[PDB]
Design a protein around this ligand. Structure first.
Ligand SMILES: Nc1ncnc2c1ncn2[C@@H]1O[C@H](COP(=O)(O)OP(=O)(O)OC[C@H]2O[C@@H](O)[C@H](O)[C@@H]2O)[C@@H](O)[C@H]1O
Length: 162
């Protein structure tokens, strides 16, 4: 039957064409300045009781549209080793929620690569944890980014596995 795919698009994740969205969220459920800024503007209702611990995900419906609030670690606060573990765990919880929801597709950003990156380039680290979690799901995954060079690198990483 249908072949599950990965794609990357360089555009605002709030404009996605998928059946649900992943917010790069904060543990206290507060609006932020990255992805979460766009998510709060588009789906403010999904922030009712969206607070959840680092390394977890919590889904809140906006109408019937699921917003999966996934909380990556802030690497300014976490050690490299503990932050790596929590980043991986957040994506594992996203994969479980995508499965539970039965969606055919999900729009997802790269967790902990912006406000929570500790000032380091974490594209490969974050993308590889995304793959480790989402590879075993059969939803179409669309990765959203904003940087031109990151779009190219993410696309290369997807393509080199096919
Ligand atoms: N609207 C967007 N669409 C797609 N990608 C985006 C968007 N906005 C930012 N990005 C990119 O998404 C990636 C994740 O960065 P952040 O959204 O800043 O997420 P994170 O690093 O996990 O920090 C989360 C923290 O920031 C606050 O926005 C949020 O409330 C939380 O406190 C970065 O590469 C960023 O450049």
């Amino acid at each position: 039957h249908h072949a599950p795919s990965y794609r990357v698009k360089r555009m605002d994740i709030a404009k996605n064409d998928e059946e649900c969205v992943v917010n790069a969220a904060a543990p206290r459920g507060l609006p932020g300045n990255g992805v979460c800024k766009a998510v709060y503007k588009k789906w403010p209702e999904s922030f009712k009781n969206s607070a959840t611990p680092v390394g977890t995900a919590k889904t809140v419906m906006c109408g019937t549209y699921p917003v999966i609030h996934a909380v990556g670690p802030n690497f300014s606060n976490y050690s490299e080793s503990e932050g790596d573990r929590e980043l991986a765990a957040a994506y594992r919880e996203v994969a479980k929620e995508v499965t539970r929801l039965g969606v055919n597709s999900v729009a997802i950003p790269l967790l902990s690569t912006g406000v929570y990156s500790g000032g380091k380039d974490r594209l490969t680290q974050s993308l590889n944890h995304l793959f480790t979690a989402m590879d075993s799901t059969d939803a179409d995954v669309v990765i959203y980014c904003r940087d031109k060079e990151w779009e190219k690198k993410i696309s290369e990483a997807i393509q080199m596995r096919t």
